[PDB]
Amino acid sequence: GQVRLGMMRHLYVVVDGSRTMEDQDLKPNRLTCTLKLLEYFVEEYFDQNPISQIGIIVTKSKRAEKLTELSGNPRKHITSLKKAVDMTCHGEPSLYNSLSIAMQTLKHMPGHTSREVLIIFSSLTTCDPSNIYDLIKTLKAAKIRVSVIGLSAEVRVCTVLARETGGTYHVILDESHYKELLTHHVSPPPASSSSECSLIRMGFPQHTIASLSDQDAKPSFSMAEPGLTLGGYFCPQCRAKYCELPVECKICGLTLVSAPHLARSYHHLFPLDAFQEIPLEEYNGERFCYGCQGELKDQHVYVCAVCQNVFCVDCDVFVHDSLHCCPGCIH
Amino acid sequence: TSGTLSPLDIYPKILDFHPVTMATFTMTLARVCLCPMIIGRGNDQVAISSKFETREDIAVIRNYGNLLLEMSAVVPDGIVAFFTSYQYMESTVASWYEQGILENIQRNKLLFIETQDGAETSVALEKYQEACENGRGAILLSVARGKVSEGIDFVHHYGRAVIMFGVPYVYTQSRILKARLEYLRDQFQIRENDFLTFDAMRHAAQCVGRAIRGKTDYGLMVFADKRFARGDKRGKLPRWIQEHLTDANLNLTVDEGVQVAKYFLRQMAQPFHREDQLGLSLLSLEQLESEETLKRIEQIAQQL
Amino acid sequence: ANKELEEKNRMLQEDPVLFQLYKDLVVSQVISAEEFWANRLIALNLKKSDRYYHGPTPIQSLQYATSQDIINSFQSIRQEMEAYTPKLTQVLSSSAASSTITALSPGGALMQGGTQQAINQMVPNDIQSELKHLYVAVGELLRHFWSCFPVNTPFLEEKVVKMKSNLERFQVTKLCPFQEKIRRQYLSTNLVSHIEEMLQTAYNKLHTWQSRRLMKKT
Amino acid sequence: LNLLVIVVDANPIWWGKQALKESQFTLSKCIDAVMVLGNSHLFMNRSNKLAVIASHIQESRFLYPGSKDGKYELLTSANEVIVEEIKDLMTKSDIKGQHTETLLAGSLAKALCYIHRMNKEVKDNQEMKSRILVIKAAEDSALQYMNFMNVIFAAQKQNILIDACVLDSDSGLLQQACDITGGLYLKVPQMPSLLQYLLWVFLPDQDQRSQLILPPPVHVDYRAACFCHRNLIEIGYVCSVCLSIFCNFSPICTTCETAFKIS
Numbered sequence A: 001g002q003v004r005l006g007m008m009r010h011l012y013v014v015v016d017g018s019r020t021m022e023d024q025d026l027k028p029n030r031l032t033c034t035l036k037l038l039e040y041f042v043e044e045y046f047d048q049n050p051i052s053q054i055g056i057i058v059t060k061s062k063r064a065e066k067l068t069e070l071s072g073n074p075r076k077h078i079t080s081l082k083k084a085v086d087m088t089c090h091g092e093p094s095l096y097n098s099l100s101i102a103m104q105t106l107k108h109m110p111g112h113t114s115r116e117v118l119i120i121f122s123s124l125t126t127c128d129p130s131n132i133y134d135l136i137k138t139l140k141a142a143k144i145r146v147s148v149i150g151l152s153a154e155v156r157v158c159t160v161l162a163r164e165t166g167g168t169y170h171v172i173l174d175e176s177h178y179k180e181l182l183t184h185h186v187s188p189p190p191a192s193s194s195s196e197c198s199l200i201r202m203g204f205p206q207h208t209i210a211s212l213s214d215q216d217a218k219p220s221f222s223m224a225e226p227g228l229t230l231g232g233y234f235c236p237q238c239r240a241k242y243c244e245l246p247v248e249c250k251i252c253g254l255t256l257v258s259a260p261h262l263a264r265s266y267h268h269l270f271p272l273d274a275f276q277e278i279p280l281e282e283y284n285g286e287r288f289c290y291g292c293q294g295e296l297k298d299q300h301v302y303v304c305a306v307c308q309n310v311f312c313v314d315c316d317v318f319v320h321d322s323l324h325c326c327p328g329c330i331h
Numbered sequence B: 001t002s003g004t005l006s007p008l009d010i011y012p013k014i015l016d017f018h019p020v021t022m023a024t025f026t027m028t029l030a031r032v033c034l035c036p037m038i039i040g041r042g043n044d045q046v047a048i049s050s051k052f053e054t055r056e057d058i059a060v061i062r063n064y065g066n067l068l069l070e071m072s073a074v075v076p077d078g079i080v081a082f083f084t085s086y087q088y089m090e091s092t093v094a095s096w097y098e099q100g101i102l103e104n105i106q107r108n109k110l111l112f113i114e115t116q117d118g119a120e121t122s123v124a125l126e127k128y129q130e131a132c133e134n135g136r137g138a139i140l141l142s143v144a145r146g147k148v149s150e151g152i153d154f155v156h157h158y159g160r161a162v163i164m165f166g167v168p169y170v171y172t173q174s175r176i177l178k179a180r181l182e183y184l185r186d187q188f189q190i191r192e193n194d195f196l197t198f199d200a201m202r203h204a205a206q207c208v209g210r211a212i213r214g215k216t217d218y219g220l221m222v223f224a225d226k227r228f229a230r231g232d233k234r235g236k237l238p239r240w241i242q243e244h245l246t247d248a249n250l251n252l253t254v255d256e257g258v259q260v261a262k263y264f265l266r267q268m269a270q271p272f273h274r275e276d277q278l279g280l281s282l283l284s285l286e287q288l289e290s291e292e293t294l295k296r297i298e299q300i301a302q303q304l
Numbered sequence C: 001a002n003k004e005l006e007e008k009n010r011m012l013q014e015d016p017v018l019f020q021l022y023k024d025l026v027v028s029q030v031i032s033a034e035e036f037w038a039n040r041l042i043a044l045n046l047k048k049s050d051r052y053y054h055g056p057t058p059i060q061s062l063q064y065a066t067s068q069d070i071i072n073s074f075q076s077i078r079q080e081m082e083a084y085t086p087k088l089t090q091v092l093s094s095s096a097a098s099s100t101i102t103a104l105s106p107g108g109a110l111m112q113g114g115t116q117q118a119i120n121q122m123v124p125n126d127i128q129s130e131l132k133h134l135y136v137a138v139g140e141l142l143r144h145f146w147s148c149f150p151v152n153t154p155f156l157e158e159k160v161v162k163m164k165s166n167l168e169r170f171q172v173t174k175l176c177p178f179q180e181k182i183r184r185q186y187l188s189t190n191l192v193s194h195i196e197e198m199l200q201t202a203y204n205k206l207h208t209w210q211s212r213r214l215m216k217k218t
Numbered sequence D: 001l002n003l004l005v006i007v008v009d010a011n012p013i014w015w016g017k018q019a020l021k022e023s024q025f026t027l028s029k030c031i032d033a034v035m036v037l038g039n040s041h042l043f044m045n046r047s048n049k050l051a052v053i054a055s056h057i058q059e060s061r062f063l064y065p066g067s068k069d070g071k072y073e074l075l076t077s078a079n080e081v082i083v084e085e086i087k088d089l090m091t092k093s094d095i096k097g098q099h100t101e102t103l104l105a106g107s108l109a110k111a112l113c114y115i116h117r118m119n120k121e122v123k124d125n126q127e128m129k130s131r132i133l134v135i136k137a138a139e140d141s142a143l144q145y146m147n148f149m150n151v152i153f154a155a156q157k158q159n160i161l162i163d164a165c166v167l168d169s170d171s172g173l174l175q176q177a178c179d180i181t182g183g184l185y186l187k188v189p190q191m192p193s194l195l196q197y198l199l200w201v202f203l204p205d206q207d208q209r210s211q212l213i214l215p216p217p218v219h220v221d222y223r224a225a226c227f228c229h230r231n232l233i234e235i236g237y238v239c240s241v242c243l244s245i246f247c248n249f250s251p252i253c254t255t256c257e258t259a260f261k262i263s
Ligand SMILES: [Zn+2]
Pocket: A235, A236, A237, A238, A239, A240, A249, A250, A251, A252, A253, A254
């Protein structure tokens, strides 16, 4: 797509902790497989979108539990998922309370954030304690976006929630299909005609080591069991002390960016194109791969659009998944 | 004209009737769209039936409740459960309470039992349709004779799994049955055991075949007792349901049927968009003018 | 109703670190208890994509000289790569290798006298507890300050909250100087001047906002 | 099983100015130090693999891929094909004027996908670790920064280390790459000792980085400028449509012609 995308993205993951998480349709029980692919999901989402954040709610026993708050580093989330392997999964879920906690945190994120909730939902009895069409009207008006990945069935309420809030609903066959669905929700989904297109004020703090062998330095502890920090990253608004970048400013409200973290997600904006895939021999006067200078010992030859060079299957998967550019069009 | 009429050999043989066309139209599909299973085998390998003639047999009602429980745990968005008689639904939902079953069915979905009031049935239907849309799971269990299954139709997500409990035989009624059967022996030529099977199957397949509206609707439709596998009773279901009744599905267990339901719903909850139909189960403007399509439509329809 | 009291209490109990903070601020005579418990509740067609191509890297000194050098260099390197492959002779003189081992030895060039990181681990534990109390307290102080500070919010109620923030800031600096005198006069180490950098930047933003708003008076 | 992928920045203009300088150190000792590093890497273990790429100004042609004079035999064949390939490359050459600054993004792209296909070649018993040496001697063009970061993040994902020996001038993007991927950066202070720098710093593999005491990491500048005036920024304004850095606040966003909502 050559369309607008939601690139600052407070996503918020609601997992079941239902009775139906313990069912053994997957190769381990559904809790374990779901949680493993969420570990992979947090990994690839922070690997691809650096500005954004994640928060994890386990929904358990008709109540909702904010298990890990909305933050932007994979260590705390994957640590909490390694903890949450050990849980119990007792009771029926509650879609009302989980969407209420996600709404309560996602009211006051600024308007340019595509505020997104991902409900990995298994069971069928959606045991709410109040009316859940007024929530869907509120979340429609609060311009949030909720997408539900479903297990074993299609449920009408999750269908109405997905088609009305703006999201997308999907049901799971396999391990591989479920990986394809979570990979589909890694990428930034396109925006509606409703979300604000603002201009967030940003800060670009340089790295600062202990200045000249600590000749008149500023010895600090940290800012969020810490040692004595000699130097590091400052802030251009409040002049505090941060170890890691990118981190939202804990005492100002500025967002702090190193700016390859803007360059880590530039491929969404000037995207790739399609490779013309042709299996047969077909006029090939360029026998060797323009990717890595090797022969084409199979019957799959892939030719670009603009330069129209030659690529094999290995160069196809590598260019379209990782390098994200044609090596010909750079030249 | 009806969606179910089977067999068509008997409506000229009752109505003093000689038609021009006796036609049956085969369900041509690009996607399985339905699966009927005959769950005629308990989980204890108890033969599921209703041979007792409404005087309760305990283990068969136990296996009916086990079927409803596990099919509740699998199916989304509303399960419709047709019993035989209101005395039998009365007795069954009685002995689903003293026996510890019905609270578990409550834990999975919300029941709406039927009564023979004209207004209480309408309120139970209205709450059943407001519970298939406000998140939770709803399950309407009724009688396969009354007005619940005559007009009140169950569309895309109101009934996913029509559970036909038992074979519906008119058992309560008097010598009107014996006398109409003596008449159909004498002055028409239609047998006893032919007309009873015809009447039972037109009621059963009448109440089953309401779940499906279009090609983009999917309805699990289970038949729960062993008698629907016995050739004459299966032979009088319509052709568009016998076409999708596989010999493996014939006489499944409870749990084999539950696993077939799971595989059914998972293979049939994916994006089945309009672009998957223009070949097989749909026709455009210009897909009609081809004479190959005319040969296809010659091959679909048949007569009796 | 005595609700708030019961809340701030229940918290202080459950949260002893917060209790600490509450003492270090209220009991320390920096602010009043009420204040503390009070405020503690669409087609995207890019126009100029060349700005994306050479990104936020600053402009390096890139002055390739006149295109005569292109022709000269093409001539010299087309002549250069004709006659080729000496492998024994040309590659290394041994004196260059000896000077390279001299450099990569730990007293020469490219060994920067780096990865030293001389630390001051003398009295670790109780000073770490002092700094935990101090960074919690100054984090709460600068939390309130930079939370109300950023947008000027040009009315009289927010300016009054800013004046209360100014009073809390000055008494916070007094309490920080008192804590530095009571702490660092034990064994003469452990510069606490980072907290003084943070509070000095609060002091500086307060005076700079004061001069800015006095310029914005008329 | 290891895979060194040397990349030699064969700028004909730069080494031409180096050979008209009449110094001691020309391109011949550069490519000879490359081949001695390659034969040393194949020499350290039987299972090691080698691939040597040469970024020209307009093409990323690979260099690589009996015993007459006493070497090991496969070292002799590899040296013969590298020598004949640089003689076919540099002598038979061209001249153009709009594109005369060297490239490094494309050769790194070929190295990334080459390591991908050679990791598909690996069977289930053994496992391949990999790195890319970059021997840079020219000035990198700014114009491919959009491309260049991408290959770094590919080497971030594919767990390929990146090392760099820069010869004449420092390079911010390449020390940036060697900071991101976990590799190593080194600016040589005297040219003709190049091989002895490589055989101690850049020859040792991943399970010898942790054993050897190496020259320390230089501090990496995360400088950032606007797309407006190219000047250094400590606080900037970044759009959420275009995702571009502006220095001073402006009404109408120039990078994507955004009808900016004003509050
Ligand atoms: Zn700040």
